Design a protein around this ligand. Structure first.
Ligand SMILES: CNC(=O)c1cc(Br)c[nH]1
Length: 114
């Protein structure tokens, strides 16, 4: 089974759009964390592989995922980064947990279809 880049994009894009639709919960995740701008120099000492929704979308728009599990890996990487860096009751952590719930509720039938 080989995937065509625009077909893979059409199949997965609704799952990414569902994350983007969440307001306010997608807001911390719509752009890359910039530790200098945010004044959190420790960020890249804990998060070695940053990921965010804008980067996932760009990868999905430019054929960077050959297989659907590569996309699923990047979504979970974004989540796991936030769950490692932030306090459990912080806004970012709580918002992350909402996005992961949305992602769970949705990604199963899409993967079954691929
Ligand atoms: C995904 N964003 C974060 O994990 C983050 C930004 C700031 Br400021 C603290 N945590």
């Amino acid at each position: 089974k080989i995937f065509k880049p625009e077909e893979l994009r059409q199949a997965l894009m609704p799952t990414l759009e569902a994350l983007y639709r969440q307001d306010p919960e997608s807001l911390p995740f719509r752009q890359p964390v910039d530790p200098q701008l945010l004044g959190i120099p420790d960020y890249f000492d804990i998060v070695k592989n940053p990921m965010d929704l804008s980067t996932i979308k760009r990868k999905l728009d430019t054929g960077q995922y050959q297989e659907p599990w590569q996309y699923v890996d990047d979504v979970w990487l974004m989540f796991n980064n936030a769950w490692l860096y932030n306090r459990k009751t912080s806004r970012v952590y709580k918002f992350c947990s909402k996005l992961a719930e949305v992602f769970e509720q949705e990604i199963d039938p899409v993967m079954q279809s691929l």
